[PDB]
């Protein structure tokens, strides 16, 4: 019952790497993905066994996490681990993108996603939810391939480098660099997706890390 295989498959998917079957999943993951540990506060890489680090476990350990204050806790995740794992996508020795795990509360469930970000630290190349428990046909449509496709090319930050992603009720404008369509008939799940990015792009999330990525830190 190791569903770390589904997690590896989802990381490969959002990275744009086609893999079919459990054997090919592991082989391509080992060839092309480099898990790394990141200190959230500084954005620096840290030493440690990134492949076996359990961020969910750390997030509830007194010595490994912090309680978020009510004002900080935009995504309603209650606590944040000190250290997170990210997944570098490798093309030879070059890093072509970085996959970030994010999570936040929906209407019924804690929703966990991977977001693939280019080496400008701003442009999204892929999004996939890998654990969510919203209602099938309503909030569960965060898994719809057409909704995920809308994220490609969107920018996380504006030119003041402040978080700018918006989940737009009724649908985003055609020209929008920052707007993504909300889920029709499921506004409350949609607000949870919004809150997830509000937290994870800010100062208590991957904000510091994505500043380092922007300034050339992955190559």
- Which parts of this chain interact with Br ion (CB under 5 A)? 59, 80-81
Least Å from the CB of residue 68 to Br ion: 10
> Please, which residue, 102 or 156, has the CB nearer to Br ion?
102
**Residues 16, 33: contact at Cβ < 8 Å?**
no
Least Å from the CB of residue 59 to Br ion: 4
> Please, which residue, 59 or 193, has the CB nearer to Br ion?
59
Least Å from the CB of residue 154 to Br ion: 23
> Please, which residue, 49 or 91, has the CB nearer to Br ion?
49
> Please, which residue, 50 or 59, has the CB nearer to Br ion?
59
Least Å from the CB of residue 44 to Br ion: 17
CA–CA gap between residue 99 and residue 17 (Å, rounded)? 13
User: Computed over its alpha carbons, how large is the radius of gyration of the chain?
Assistant: 17
> Please, which residue, 38 or 167, has the CB nearer to Br ion?
38
Least Å from the CB of residue 110 to Br ion: 11
Task: Return left, alpha or beta for 64; rule: phi > 0 is left, psi -120 to 50 is alpha, else beta.
Answer: alpha
């Amino acid at each position: 019952p190791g569903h770390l295989r589904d997690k590896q498959s989802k990381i490969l998917q959002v990275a744009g790497i086609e893999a079919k079957g459990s054997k090919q999943i592991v082989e391509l993951f080992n060839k092309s993905i480099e898990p790394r540990l990141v200190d959230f506060n500084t954005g620096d890489f840290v030493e440690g066994d990134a492949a076996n680090y359990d961020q969910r476990k750390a997030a509830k350990e007194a010595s490994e996490s912090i309680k978020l204050t009510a004002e900080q806790d935009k995504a309603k995740i209650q606590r944040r681990a000190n250290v997170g794992v990210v997944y570098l996508v490798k093309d030879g020795d070059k890093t072509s993108k970085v996959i970030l795990p994010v999570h936040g509360n929906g209407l019924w469930s804690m929703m966990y996603a991977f977001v693939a970000v280019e080496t400008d630290g701003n442009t999204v190349s892929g999004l996939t939810y890998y654990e969510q428990g919203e209602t099938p046909g309503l909030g569960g449509e965060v898994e719809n391939p057409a909704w995920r496709a809308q994220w490609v090319g969107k920018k996380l930050f504006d030119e003041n480098h402040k978080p700018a992603i918006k989940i737009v009720k009724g649908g985003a404008p055609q020209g929008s660099e920052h707007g993504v369509d909300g889920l029709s008939g499921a506004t409350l799940t949609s607000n949870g997706v919004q809150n997830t990015f509000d937290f994870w792009l800010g100062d208590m999330g991957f904000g510091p890390f994505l500043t380092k990525v922007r300034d050339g830190g992955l190559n």
